[PDB]
């Protein structure tokens, strides 16, 4: 959706209650004022839209809590310290203050205010900097510093006031939000996900129902997901793997209309309560991942987090993601630990019968375009699909959708022969160069020496412009002129080999760009090449086959070698050679038409876990749009919204340094709409609606499992297969 702005709720009332009988109490006013001070210091506060708090009404509290409980809580405001202590002692880990009720009402109300702004598209997203927390509060009792269940009320409120059918509650606070679990235990309309320290019940709240076996009951069976950690010192790699392999597949199947986050920061490094080692930066990635599930409709509310600085950094990292700032560099490993893999696998097995998605297992944007690249043409067949108008139609669509004016225009330039020699033989360079002065008879003769190649006197210059345009784009990204970019270029490149032209490709644009990126930074710069063109990029695979500095990932229609380029080199068992073993990932599709379900599943279980463990410094996309719905050559059904979601996933890698390079794509409308959607994502627009992602075709399930088996010894994040 086209909503903009990040809401922030903060009122002085959030500091007007504290523990009267213990000055060392961790749940203190400084928690929220430290967060507010850092947001201001980091320049984040001034970038947010200030949203006023409001007091929750009795009717809204009654959506979750009993009348008797609400009346008892109301009466605490007139109590003495002695009366407050006597009542607090009746609950587990709770204090009371005469200002507690008033602040708790404004704490619930602040979330309802953000829910209103987000559900009416006044804002895209928001964060409530509230205290007291809420996720432990139950229908009739206080618990773990909570009086009212903020998010449980907000979810039921969203359903009643804004006609939301499905709400997803994600709880990344180090403790299990048993309050939320109990309230929605039998409710299929509210999916509750909690990741928490458990240690076989030895960690507070010491509940057997905090285990992965508690999947909900009655109509709500399968709608309660617990991810218990049974070892301390969990890191960002563990949280990110859990979101990739478990939460995202389920969330996409659930299709919520709203995402609510119980945003606790007690899992962050330095928290005295948590015992975990999660970097604050991890929360930027987690927040980014949640933007894709409800078309950006995302509300975060502060839960726990007791190290003042750690909590403030966690809030700042999440806020940066909500505002659309590029994802940060992750300071730790992209690989999960064995204990985390064990917990993720157990949760997957416990929720497996309820979710088809789990049943698979056995910033500035640059734009480059030059109309001169239209000069390359087929003089013998004017209807040949690799049309000059492919690039002009894509460019026109960017102008119609007003994307062009939002981009920084990067000039096209010719690649030099020295730059072509980064990937190609001097013999191949000279043969293509010679075509510039050839008569039509000689151009026909030369084209026939290759597999699927047409040449004109303008072909060599167009191929130099396609390569040079991508080098200028990679240079703009790596020198900080832009964060990411799109290259509307032709002829394509991924079929071109070191010593030969092939399948409409003269020079390997993506391969040359990866080597060029390395020549302007360092030889070992980690480059990820994601090739989503419907055909296997045979040339790219071969160029980097023995290389561990360039990870090549291709998704392609294979059909047991019956589809172009018709070689067994495209099969899943081709994992690379020598030090490059594990750095060549082929995802071959067999048995007809694939679409968004299969592509999203391949990204959740293969592309994203491998890419995150590789930790690229630059992401290149060999973006052919010939797997698109309507393509005359591909026969596939990837929709423009499908491509937008794939682009969105890749943006959390390489601190957002993503270059989208045009490859194939032959339906002019399909490629114009698909590539425009990718640019829209790079620009930071909310991911669009994307329904019906299950069931997958049976043969796609076979393909994904074949890949997992081939790459599991190389990549730990794949060992989620028990
Ligand atoms: C012996 C119990 C171990 C865990 N807890 C309880 C607890 C409950 C909730 C949260 C929380 O993060 N709530 O949002 C943190 C700790 C505590 O240690 N709580 C505590 C209570 C009073 C003073 C200092 C600490
Ligand atoms: C017997 C060959 C079968 C595959 N090919 C060739 C081909 C090569 C490369 C690509 C491609 O997407 N290159 O970027 C697509 C098709 C074709 O079908 N090519 C074709 C040529 C003219 C008109 C219509 C289609
Ligand atoms: Cl020819
Ligand atoms: K939790
Ligand atoms: K539920
Ligand atoms: K491909
Ligand atoms: K490689
Ligand atoms: Zn907590
Ligand atoms: Zn192709």
Give me ligand 1 centre to Cα 513, in Å: 53
CA atoms of 658 and 486, how far apart (whole Å): 9
The answer to whether 169 and 191 are in contact (CB under 8 A) is yes
Nearest residue to 621 via CA among 509, 498, 516, 524: 509
Mutate to test the pocket of ligand 1, among 133, 144, 194 (most ligand atoms within 8 A of CB): 144
How do the residues of the chain divide into helix, strand and coil, expressed in percent and rounded to 5? 45, 15, 45
What residues pair up with 658 in beta bridges, in sequence order? 619
Atom of ligand 1 nearest to the CA of 133: 14
Q: Is 78 exposed, middle or buried (0-12, 13-18, 19+ CB in 10 A)?
A: exposed
**142 in Cβ contact with 170 (< 8 Å):** no
State the Rg of the chain over Cα.
Answer: 27
**Do 185 and 217 form a contact (C-beta atoms < 8 A)?**
yes
CA-nearest residue, atom 10 of ligand 2: 503
Residue 550 annotated in ligand binding: yes
Please tell me the distance from the alpha carbon of residue 291 to that of residue 259, in angstroms, as a whole number. 8
Of the candidates 293, 286, 158, 171, the one whose C-alpha atom is nearest the C-alpha of residue 227 is: 171
Q: Phi and psi of 285, rounded to 5°?
A: -65, -50
**Is position 115 annotated in a ligand binding site?**
no
Is 367 found in the same domain as 338?
no
DSSP 299: E
CA of 204 to the centre of ligand 1 (A): 8
Tokens representing residue 598 in the block: 């299969």
Does 145 contact ligand 1 (Cβ within 6 A)?
A: yes
Q: Which of 309, 333, 362 is the last residue of a domain?
A: 362
- In whole angstroms, give the CA distance from residue 435 to residue 375: 14
Look up the CATH number of the domain holding residue 413.
Answer: 3.40.800.20
Residues 343, 489: one domain? Answer: no
Indicate the top mutation candidate among 97, 150, 204 to test ligand 1's pocket, ranked by most ligand atoms within 8 A of CB: 204
What is the Cα–Cα distance from 711 to 582, expressed in whole angstroms? 6
Cα of 205 vs centre of ligand 1, distance in Å, is 9
Q: From CA 710, how far away is CA 414, in angstroms rounded? A: 40
Are residue 274 and residue 400 in the same domain, yes or no? no
**Within 13 Å and on the Cβ side, how many CA atoms surround 337?**
16
Find, among 708, 6, 46, the residue nearest to 360 by Cα: 708
Picking from 329, 341, 458, the residue whose alpha carbon sits closest to that of residue 388 is 458
Nearest ligand to the CA of 440 is 3
Strands of the 190-197 sheet, one edge to the other: 49-51, 6-9, 125-128, 298-302, 258-263, 167-171, 190-197, 224-229
Query: Is the domain of 347 the same as that of 454?
Result: no
566 in contact with ligand 2, CB cutoff 6 A? no
Catalytic-residue membership of 136: yes
Q: Which position among 97, 136, 196, 645 bears the catalytic label?
A: 136
Q: Tell me if 131 CB under 6 Å of ligand 1.
A: no
Q: Which of 362, 388, 407 is at the close of a domain? A: 362
E strands, 163-246, where?
Answer: 167-171, 190-197, 224-229
Q: DSSP readout, 161-209?
A: HH--S-EEEEE-SSS--HHHHHHHTT-TTEEEEEEEE-GGGTSTT--GG
Q: Which residues pair with 666 in a beta bridge?
A: none
Residue 316 · residue 34 · CB < 8 Å: no
Both tokens assigned to 634? 């591909």
Whether 299 and 367 map to the same domain: the answer is no
The catalytic residue among 424, 495, 536, 645 is 495
For ligand 1, atom 9, which residue shows the shortest CA distance? 144
Which residues are close to ligand 6, an ion, with C-beta < 5 A?
Answer: 531, 533, 554, 556
Cα-based distances in Å from 51 to 123, 317, 716: 10, 20, 43
Gap from CA of 304 to ligand 1 centroid (Å): 10
Q: What total number of domains does the chain contain?
A: 2
| Residue 622 annotated in ligand binding | yes
Q: Name residue, tokens 């929605």.
A: 184
Ligand 2 midpoint to CA 565 (Å):
9
Whether 133 is in the pocket of ligand 1, judged by its Cβ within 6 Å, is yes
Q: Indicate if 383 belongs to the active site.
A: no
Instruction: Report the C-alpha dihedral over residues 71, 92, 178, 159, rounded to 10 degrees.
Output: 20
Euclidean distance between CA atoms 140 and 90, whole angstroms: 12
Q: How far is the C-alpha of 290 from the C-alpha of 298, rounded, in Å?
A: 7
Nearest CA to ligand 1 atom 22: 93
Please state the atom number of ligand 2 nearest to the C-alpha of residue 564: 4
Phi, psi of 29 (to 5 degrees): -55, -35
CB neighbours of 487 closer than 8 A, spacing ≥ 6?
Answer: 368, 466, 469, 470, 473, 659, 660, 661, 662
- Of 328, 344, 362, which residue sits at a domain end? 362
Task: Please tell me the distance between residue 577's alpha carbon and the centre of ligand 7 in angstroms.
Answer: 8
CA of 454 to the centre of ligand 6 (A): 22
Can you list the positions of beta strands (E) in 271-406?
Answer: 298-302, 365-369
Torsion angle of the four alpha carbons 183, 186, 188, 192, in this order, in degrees rounded to the nearest 10: 40
Does the CB atom of residue 231 touch ligand 1 within 6 A? no
The residue whose C-alpha atom lies closest to atom 13 belonging to ligand 2 is 503
- Domain shared by 696 and 670, yes or no: yes
| Same domain for 303 and 434 | no
- Between the CA of 532 and the centroid of ligand 6 the distance, in Å, is 4
Within this chain, do residues 368 and 353 fall inside the same structural domain, yes or no?
no
Regarding the beta carbon of 635 and ligand 2, being less than 6 Å apart is answered: no
Q: Is the CB of 664 under 6 A from ligand 2?
A: yes
- Neighbouring C-beta atoms of residue 345, cutoff 10 Å: 18
State the residue range of the domain holding 346: 1-362
Q: Is the domain of 346 the same as that of 366? A: no
CA distances (Å), origin 167, targets 193, 213, 300: 11, 22, 13
Q: Which atom of ligand 1 is nearest to the CA of 22?
A: 23
Closest CA to 256 of 308, 312, 188, 181: 188
What is the spatial distance between Cα 608 and Cα 602, in angstroms, rounded to a whole number? 9
Residue 397 and residue 503 in one domain: yes
The residue to mutate among 462, 503, 510, 532, having the most atoms of ligand 2 within 8 angstroms of its beta carbon, is 503
Residue closest by Cα to atom 3 of ligand 1: 204
- Whether residue 395 is found in the same domain as residue 340: no
Q: Is 200 annotated as a binding residue?
A: no
CA 278 to chain centroid, in Å, comes to 18
Same domain, 201 and 85: yes
Residue at token pair 């006023």: 52
Q: How many CB atoms lie within 10 A of CB 582?
A: 19
């Amino acid at each position: 959706s086209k909503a903009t702005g990040t809401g922030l709720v903060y009122v002085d009332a959030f500091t007007r209650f504290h523990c009267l009988w213990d000055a060392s109490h961790p749940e203190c006013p400084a928690r929220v004022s430290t967060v507010m001070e850092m947001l201001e210091t980091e320049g984040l506060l001034g970038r947010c839209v200030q949203v006023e708090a409001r007091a929750v009404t009795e009717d809204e509290l009654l959506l979750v809590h009993t009348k008797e409980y609400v009346e008892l809580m109301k009466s605490t405001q007139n109590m003495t310290e002695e009366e407050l202590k006597t009542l607090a002692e009746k609950y587990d880990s709770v204090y009371l203050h005469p200002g507690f009720f008033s602040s708790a009402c404004l704490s619930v109300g602040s979330v309802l205010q953000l829910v209103d702004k987000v559900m009416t598209s006044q804002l895209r997203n928001g964060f409530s900097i509230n205290r007291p927390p809420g996720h432990h509060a139950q229908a009739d009792k206080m618990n773990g510093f909570c009086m009212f269940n903020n998010l449980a009320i907000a979810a039921r409120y969203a359903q009643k006031r804004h006609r939301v059918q499905r709400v997803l509650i994600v709880d990344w606070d180090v403790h299990h939000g048993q309050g939320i679990q109990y309230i929605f235990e039998e409710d299929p309309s509210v999916l509750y996900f909690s990741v928490h320290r458990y240690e076989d019940g030895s960690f507070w709240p010491h509940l057997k129902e905090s285990d992965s076996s508690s999947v909900g009951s009655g109509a709500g069976q399968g709608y309660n997901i617990n991810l218990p950690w049974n070892k301390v010192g969990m890191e960002s790699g563990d949280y990110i793997t859990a979101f990739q392999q478990l939460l995202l597949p389920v969330a996409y199947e659930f299709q919520p209309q709203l995402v609510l986050v119980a945003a606790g920061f007690d899992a962050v490094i330095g928290d005295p309560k948590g015992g975990m080692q999660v970097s604050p930066e991890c929360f930027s990635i987690l927040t980014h991942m949640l933007k894709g599930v409800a078309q950006g409709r995302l509300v975060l509310a502060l839960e726990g987090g007791y190290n003042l600085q750690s909590t403030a950094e966690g809030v700042c990292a999440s806020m940066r993601s909500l505002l659309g700032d590029p994802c940060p560099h992750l300071p730790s490993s992209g690989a999960p630990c064995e204990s985390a893999l064990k917990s993720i696998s157990k949760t997957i097995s416990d929720l497996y019968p309820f979710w088809k998605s789990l049943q698979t297992f056995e910033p500035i944007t640059g734009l480059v375009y030059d109309q001169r690249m239209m000069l390359h043409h087929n003089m013998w067949d004017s209807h040949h699909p690799e049309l000059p108008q492919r690039i002009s139609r894509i460019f026109s669509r960017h102008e119609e959708l007003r994307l062009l004016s939002r981009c920084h225009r990067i000039p096209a330039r010719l690649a030099t022969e020295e730059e072509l020699a980064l990937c190609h033989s001097s013999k191949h360079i000279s043969i293509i160069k010679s075509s510039e002065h050839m008569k039509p008879r000689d151009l026909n003769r030369l084209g026939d020496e290759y597999n699927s190649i047409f040449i004109s006197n303008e072909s060599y210059t167009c191929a130099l412009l396609a390569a040079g345009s991508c080098f200028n784009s990679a240079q703009a990204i790596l020198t900080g002129q832009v964060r990411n970019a799109v290259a509307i270029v032709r002829p394509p490149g991924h079929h071109a080999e070191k010593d030969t032209a092939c399948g409409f490709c003269f020079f390997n644009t993506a391969a040359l760009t990866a080597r060029y990126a390395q020549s302007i930074t360092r030889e070992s710069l980690r480059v990820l090449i994601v090739d989503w063109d419907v055909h296997h990029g045979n040339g790219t695979q071969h160029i980097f086959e023995e290389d561990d500095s360039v990870l090549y990932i291709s998704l392609h229609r294979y059909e047991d070698g019956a589809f172009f380029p018709n070689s067994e080199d495209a099969n899943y068992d081709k994992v690379g050679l020598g030090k490059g073993r594990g750095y060549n990932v082929n995802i071959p599709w067999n048995g007809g038409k694939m679409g968004d379900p299969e592509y999203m599943a391949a990204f959740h279980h293969l592309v994203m876990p491998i890419a995150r463990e590789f930790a690229p410094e630059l992401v290149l996309v060999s973006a052919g749009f010939d797997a698109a719905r309507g393509d005359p050559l591909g026969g596939f059904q990837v929709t423009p919204e499908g491509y937008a979601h794939l682009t969105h996933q890749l943006m959390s890698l390489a601190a957002g340094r993503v270059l989208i390079i045009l490859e194939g794509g032959y339906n002019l409308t399909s490629i114009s709409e698909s590539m425009s959607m990718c640019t829209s994502m790079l620009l930071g627009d909310s991911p669009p609606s994307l329904d019906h992602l299950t069931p997958l075709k049976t043969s796609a399930t076979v393909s994904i499992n074949n890949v997992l088996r081939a790459h599991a010894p190389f990549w730990s994040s794949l060992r989620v297969n028990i």
